[PDB]
Motif scaffolding. Structure first.
Motif: not given
Ligand SMILES: [Zn+2]
Ligand SMILES: [Zn+2]
Lengths: 397, 200, 397, 397, 397
Positions: D153-154, E153-154
């Protein structure tokens, strides 16, 4: 020491001839040798490292034998084996490195490390085997005091030397006569220059000579000899002999006249070649002598005549030269060359582990310094250290 | 020779006996076995060894060379074309497996069955059996029509075993077969099965 | 794959140890291995070729074995054997070549050809044996995800690059300052020139620098470093950077001042040498940085002073240079070098059979293009292809 | 190594499934595994620590088995168990940490510590079990040399880089044209500015481009692409390229024209998007190229016209930009991201114990430095070290 | 379908729990399940591929069950197993992909491919087991009709939308009033601007409002609400509503007055927050309504007073804004989010195999287009396709 050797050829011929498939019968003779080892080892304890940035590591032995049962080899057999090999590999590496750093003046030939000193012990001699690795081959023959010998491509016999000698000079450096050269590795380039183009020289010929004394005899050398020294065929501004000023060299090249190369051994001419360029053989020598001349051209076209006046200023400097390269040769002493990694291995292990300068080798294992003062102690240590590097390269590159 | 059986004592016993000197029996058990443990780790007198290497290379050849016993059989529940060979005449032989799973009888028998085979047979699937096996010749042209070869099999199931697995061949020569009302009628052999015994 | 290997060492150690006369007990262990093969094969069909000008030859197997009796070998024994070998030789050749041309973006590290894909099969593994040929040795150690390594005399790490950079220039190109170089193979030559001879430079010194980034790390490198760049010591007429005109370079050479060579690894200095010419060791590096200066001679004889006026025109162009040659080194990735025939073998087979350009390798297996963009795919394919070439050279040269 | 793994899942699935109550039958399969361990251990002796500020601790084993008797579990059963677990926990912690600090160039993949080196031994392999922990899962698949892969994630693929490039500039910095950007982590923001608002540009359009080369390929990336670079939408006083002065940036933002994003792999376009803002998928790429233009508005209200005169001074600087964020992606190499604590765990253990800088990792495990020069050695060490951190986090957070 | 699932957890819990060294009993319960499979399979043949660039490979089954060598597995056991697994892996991959491309309007919730249609057959049901993978977990609960639910998430609920609405405008665009926004993914930024700074507005207050209608209800949402819209806080030149010209926006930001956020469900207020910035919970909503005001400052220092004259020209444009981000939420329908790779997996497989646009999904699986017209058919197909992607990621990443 020889002990050490085996340890490897054991592993190599092992990590090589042992794989998922093959018949037992092809390794029967091998398997044995192997086990024999494990036994002799088990129970014993070791210690490596402790110097400089080298880690200290202890090793113990307690391993099972090998199934001399099976017909063929099943994958499972290998893996249970490879697991045992990997401990020995990672071992030897540490063993080599530990003895590849220590030097010694008195006895720089024998073992140093606590690790190896223990191996030369009699109870381990029960492991020697297949010494066909060129280096160990020669290690033995030297113990029995007999005629050794190695093989080298572009050997490294000449310590770096780049200089000149002014046979005729004056403050202005406007009418010089002398030679300049570069001796390095397996090559020699030398030029003879005469600013006056032998205008006042007997027979209008200026003689030149370049002598190079090898620190070790080379035998069976294949050599390329070519006219001209390209390195000294271009304009240069050079420092004077006393370092107080700079002179100008503006060469114009003529063919070297009456070229004679002599390969001498203890003052005796062993091989002599008169004006023979190309490939020549020098079978045994400790000295090379290159003699060549600059002969003022007896007949000159206007353009040429203009370069060589009867009176100064001399603006075009007549130059003749030679280039000699030892492609291959045999030496009774270990040397660095253009193909073997021994010097680089030893130098690299010492550099990586921040090994302190010792009493035998020059700082950084500097080749020029080493070959310039190639004492018996440096050679014995170098051979020990090169032989170990070669044992190590059978497994770890 | 994968004889995962005797190996321990068996050989040792005879060994010592021939040595005369001692009366086995009173040889503590840690002794006899330990004795093997050491024996198994040695070369082999070229003589000895050199011969075994020879036997193994021809082993295969012998086994199929015999008159009684062939290596495994095939089931395809697919009307198949009987082949013809100069020596056996009109028979159902297969000189090659390939295209059907292989089930080491030896493995099965020795280790009990999980019916893997039982299922494959039941939903009637193409399968093969490997190893040495009994044997049966038959001349009954009729037989073939009766599809006897697809019978024998069911058996096994009952209880494990698989010894009683005589398979069938049809040595149907244009002669010794009283049953020859065959070549008198346009037609072709429909064998549902055949065997591995390679030709002599 | 490894399978393949065996097939050869089998034949070599065969066409070699099986001669009229020898004693059987020298091949007992061998003979066996051999037969074992024939067996596994017989009953199999293969097919090679089908691409470009490569013939599509078909093969079948059905062979008898070999006697085991006979103290010694009788001529007759050989000939009946050699006849069987020759079919395998002519086979393997076709097998190698067929897998030595195909490339795959995806798994350029896996088998390609219908011929080999079939070999990696399990039922063939029963043939593996004696993996001591340097290349296969490393093929395994890698497949297991471990530390590889090779040996090269005059490696080919530098893609050809011959250019210059003018740090000070003007339209007339009569007062330039910059560097020119040639990076090729294992050698670098670089010259720094300053037409003004640092007349207006701070401390009358002009600094130069040349950086070369290797596409792969080299370890245990033995290197020759010499002052001067002979290649850039002569008069030249060169094209301008924009190609619109030509400039004149008329060098006069001075010794490079404050020479510093750094062998860096990931930006870190691993080895550094200050003005050390001759043989030096660089133990692990991915970059070479050569820094050197031109220092205007503080004291000049008239002849020298005349070359360097206080004002233009500047007719003699002060030049300093360096020459660096990597004699030998070890690389974890396969590379072309001056001794191995791998690249030439692969390139030659592809050229002879008119193999079409594929998706991985540059047209003609061009080395410069290959090493310039040495992607993981090109390296995996190159290694596969080099290892096969080495297997082939054990039998066919 | 894999060994290590087990040790934990053993304890976790232990300190978890073993409690005052439950039926034996739910752990029967477990209990066993456990005991099996104790056995293999008992008798053996260990040593951890010794480097930097890390304490040295020795451990011995001599423990009783487990009552495979009982039906249910009584409180007393637990406590006598928990007491044994706690010694292993406090153990593993020390084991992890000890191997989570050592680095190594040559073989930075294999074990280092005296503690672990001993575990890879064969006699302990009798403990492996349940390898469903994403990391170990991939550790294995890599040994067998197969296609790995992690989830992020990111992700943290872009080394920090914040700079600009002036394509048109002059001393006063009153009429510049160029780009400025910030590449960091999983985000890129880039702005193209033209002080002249393309007044003299062909088609009144100024082209911009921003290329970012990833150090590792990312696959299956979910990306947010939005017009405008908020980070470069406000007034700034910036240092000049040479650091000698400061320039003024006074942006006014226009929509980026002809936006084209290309995700390339080895120079090939794998995905291309034309002016598509929002969520886009880039399935496999090692490079991102963002091209966008500033087009002078063909029609302007008075207020707008006033910002863009035909002649300098240019006081409002036309700016167009893009923002790209990689929300999630898969990488074949370990990386830091916005959710996993691996990097932080490794960095934290090293910092807490004052571990000296080693030969592989940059000082402080600095991410930017690490990803900028993400060598094979750093990656192998990082993966080893990340996998250990993940094993540790199963028990100690 | 569920069938499919098993096939994997079988392999995972397999390629995971089956390693060199684990006690048999730790897999007794497992081994079984496995075999059971092989049986049911063997005999039946399959076809995969047959679309776009997707290859048509034929799979056939013929495998022997699994032994049980007692007391921890021997290496050999594994390899003979892994060989069988690899055929299933390479299988499933092809199975997933083949059903991950087909779409169907009528019944796009059931199996399409010849491969899977055959699996839903009864004779296979005998395999299903351990349905703990979040996705399958919800696949079942839906077949029976009950409360499903996923975690994101988001979340990616807002189709990209970037625009404005001028509530007061005139040709010169010198005195505008309205709102501009960016709805994308999980974020909303909205600004209300009034060039006149509410000079003639009742109570010197201008009301603004922004309504966003979700295509699916979100429950249990954790949301960050902050004052100001940074995205609309800088100078811009924007295209007019009719595209005929461009206007100038020169914002100056004031705090949003009387902020009220309402999360509505079917027109009913479920949650309401008055001026609460930071973290807020919206438990169930299909609509978000943001109301905020610009209130002309009743007291102004000279510098402020100067920005807001009583008469035009209005050169500083009063702007108030809000930023809202949905960090996490639960949705009864599958959606793309910032962590899951499902959308990217499906989109990537289709792109790699050049799958033609079908009748259900928008070209390129474009998220904005998909969520904008999230029909029941698109959702059923998306869920089927996302569930398959999740099954695939258990083995292949
Ligand atoms: Zn995030
Ligand atoms: Zn050479």
């Amino acid at each position: 020491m020889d002990v050490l050797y085996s340890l490897s050829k054991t592993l190599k011929d092992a990590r090589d001839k042992i794989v998922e498939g093959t018949l037992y019968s092809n390794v029967s003779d091998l398997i044995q040798q192997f086990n024999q080892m494990i036994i002799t080892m088990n129970g014993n304890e070791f210690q490596t490292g402790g110097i400089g940035n080298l880690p200290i590591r202890n090793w113990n032995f307690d391993f099972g034998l090998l199934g001399t049962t099976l017909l063929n080899l099943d994958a499972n057999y290998v893996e249970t084996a490879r697991n045992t090999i990997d401990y020995f590999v990672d071992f030897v590496d540490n063993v080599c490195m530990d003895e590849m750093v220590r030097e010694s003046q008195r006895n720089g030939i024998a073992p140093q490390s606590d690790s190896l000193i223990k191996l030369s012990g009699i109870k381990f001699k029960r492991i020697n085997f297949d010494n066909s690795s060129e280096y160990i081959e020669n290690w033995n023959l030297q113990n029995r005091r007999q005629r050794t010998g190695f093989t080298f491509h572009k050997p490294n016999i000449f310590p770096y030397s780049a200089s000149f000698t002014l046979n005729r000079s004056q403050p202005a450096h406007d009418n010089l006569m002398g030679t300049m050269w570069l001796n390095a590795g397996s090559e020699i380039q030398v030029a003879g220059f005469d600013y006056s183009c032998a205008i006042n020289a007997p027979a209008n010929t200026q003689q030149f000579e370049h002598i190079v004394q090898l620190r070790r005899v080379l035998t069976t050398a294949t050599i390329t000899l070519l006219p001209d020294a390209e390195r000294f065929s271009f304009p240069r501004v050079i420092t004077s002999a006393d370092g107080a000023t700079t002179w100008y060299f503006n060469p114009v090249i003529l063919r070297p006249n009456n070229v004679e190369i002599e390969f001498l051994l203890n003052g005796q001419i062993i091989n002599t070649y008169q004006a023979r360029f190309g490939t020549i053989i020098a079978r045994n020598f400790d000295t090379i002598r290159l003699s060549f001349q600059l002969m003022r051209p007896p007949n000159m076209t206007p353009a040429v005549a203009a370069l060589f006046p009867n009176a100064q200023p001399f603006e075009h400097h007549a130059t003749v030269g030679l280039t000699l390269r030892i492609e291959s040769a045999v030496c009774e002493s270990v040397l660095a060359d253009a193909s073997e990694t021994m010097l680089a291995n030893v130098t690299s292990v010492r550099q990586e582990y921040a090994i302190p300068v010792g009493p035998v080798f020059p700082p950084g294992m500097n080749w020029t310094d080493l070959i310039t003062n190639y004492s018996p102690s440096r050679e014995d240590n170098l051979q020990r250290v090169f032989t170990v590097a070669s044992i190590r390269s059978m497994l770890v590159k | 020779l994968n004889l995962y059986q005797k190996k321990m004592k068996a050989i040792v016993e005879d060994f010592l006996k021939r040595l005369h000197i001692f009366d086995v029996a009173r040889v503590p058990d840690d002794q006899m076995y330990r004795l093997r443990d050491r024996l198994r780790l040695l070369p082999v007198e070229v003589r000895r060894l050199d011969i075994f290497n020879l036997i193994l290379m021809n082993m295969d050849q012998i086994e199929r060379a015999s008159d009684k016993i062939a290596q495994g059989v095939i089931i395809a529940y697919r009307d198949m074309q009987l082949e013809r060979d100069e020596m056996y005449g009109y028979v159902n032989i297969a000189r090659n497996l390939d295209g059907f799973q292989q089930i080491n009888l030896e493995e099965l028998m020795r280790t009990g069955d999980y019916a893997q085979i039982t299922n494959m047979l039941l939903n009637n699937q193409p399968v093969a059996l490997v190893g040495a096996l009994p044997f049966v010749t038959d001349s009954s042209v009729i037989s073939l029509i009766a599809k006897l070869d697809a019978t024998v099999f069911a058996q096994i199931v009952k209880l494990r075993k698989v010894d009683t697995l005589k398979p069938i061949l049809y040595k149907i020569n244009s002669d010794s077969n009283d049953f020859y009302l065959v070549a008198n009628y346009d037609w072709v052999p429909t064998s549902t099965t055949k065997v591995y015994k390679q030709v002599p």
